[PDB]
């Protein structure tokens, strides 16, 4: 009788840790959700084949409204696993599910997996230099989200890099591209006019981290806004003040304009 929160990693079924696989293999019941992120290099079938168990996929409503009615009851008399893309507790509200587990008398354990949050390291930007993070959300009706703009502003003033998670509508199979994020940011800039995000802003795009050949690109918005970065998922990053070696990596590995080598200390 136990509940395991097991991360599946960044891109495909092999991104799960050995620990996660061996534990998942011996669980009586295996549940999972695929609405918090997108694993672009695998399928439910390949995941099931790898762990050797049939996986019951749950919707956001099943989880948020009925986790304690669907999953927890089984954990009381069996070993249950709950799979999620990336790391189960990063940029999700799944941590709160551990409280529901406790209140239901069910012990829970967490098995980590590679997360987009640390995979940013492959962009060459020092991870300790990232500041507050934010999510670029799709406007809906008359509601136009903009707080993420201020996050960038706050971090940039501090010389810190800003990680921008991009929106996702799993049931509609909508995955926000870095291009759409840039478009939205320019519109917010027009309204606020804080000089935070313009055509001359340097940005970094990372697509399909976890694959052997992820797309890593850096450059000015004016030049990248219409560039094809490949299939989703994507994340957008607005660097703050760059260290010499960060700039060198962006140029050498991410194809950034050589002019950014000349940092303005």
Ligand X SMILES: Nc1ncnc2c1ncn2[C@@H]1O[C@H](CSCC[C@H](N)C(=O)O)[C@@H](O)[C@H]1O
Q: Which of residues 163-182 bind ligand X (CB under 6 A)?
A: 165-166, 168
Contact 225, 234 (CB under 8 A): no
CB atoms within 10 A of CB 150: 15
How many residues does the structure list for the chain?
265
Q: Which listed residue (92, 108, 123, 177) binds ligand X by CB under 6 A?
A: 92
Spatial contact of 84 and 5, defined as CB atoms under 8 Å apart: yes
Q: Nearest distance from residue 195's CB to ligand X, in Å?
A: 25
**Does 3 appear as a known binding residue?**
no
Q: Does residue number 253 form part of the binding site for a second copy (CB under 8 A)?
A: yes
| Partner from a second copy, ligand X, Na ion, none contacting 94, C-beta within 5 to 8 A by type | a second copy
Q: Which of 113, 108, 160 is nearest to 14 (CA)?
A: 113
DSSP state of 131: -
166 is in an annotated binding site: yes
When asked if residue 132 is in the footprint of a second copy (CB under 8 A), the reply is yes
Shortest spacing between CB 75 and ligand X, in angstroms: 21
Q: How far is the CB of 205 from Na ion (least distance, A)?
A: 18
Judged by beta carbon, residue 6 or residue 225, the one nearer a second copy is: 6
Which residues are near Na ion by CB under 5 A? 130
Which residue do the tokens 């998670």 mark? 165
Binding to ligand X by residue 116, rule CB under 6 A? yes
> What stretches of 72-134 show up as alpha helix (H) in DSSP?
72-75, 96-103, 116-119
């Amino acid at each position: 009788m136990v509940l395991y929160f097991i991360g599946l990693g960044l891109y495909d079924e092999r991104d799960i840790t050995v620990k996660g696989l061996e534990i998942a293999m011996k669980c009586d019941y295996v549940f999972a959700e695929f609405y918090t992120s997108l694993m672009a290099g695998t399928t439910l079938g390949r995941i099931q084949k790898l762990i050797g168990k049939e996986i019951r996929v749950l919707s956001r409503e099943d989880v948020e409204l009925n986790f304690e009615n669907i999953v927890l009851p089984l954990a009381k008399e069996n070993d249950v696993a709950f799979l999620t893309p990336g790391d189960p507790l990063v940029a999700t509200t799944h941590a709160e599910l551990r409280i529901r587990a406790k209140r239901a008398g069910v012990e829970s354990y967490v098995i980590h997996a590679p997360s987009i949050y640390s995979a940013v390291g492959i962009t060459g930007l020092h991870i300790y230099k990232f500041g507050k993070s934010a999510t670029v959300a799709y406007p809906e009706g008359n509601w136009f989200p903009t707080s993420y703009y201020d996050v960038i502003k706050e971090n940039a003033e501090r010389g810190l890099h800003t990680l921008l998670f991009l929106d996702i509508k799993a049931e509609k199979r909508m995955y926000m591209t870095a291009n759409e994020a840039m478009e939205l940011l320019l519109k917010v800039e027009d309204m606020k006019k804080g000089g935070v995000f313009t055509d001359d802003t340097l940005v970094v795009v990372l697509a399909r981290a976890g694959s052997l050949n992820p797309t890593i690109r850096a450059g000015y918005v004016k030049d990248l806004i219409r560039e094809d970065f490949g299939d989703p998922p994507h994340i957008l990053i607005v660097p703050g003040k760059l260290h010499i070696v960060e700039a060198e990596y962006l140029v050498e590995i991410a194809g950034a304009p050589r002019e950014i080598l000349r940092v303005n200390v």
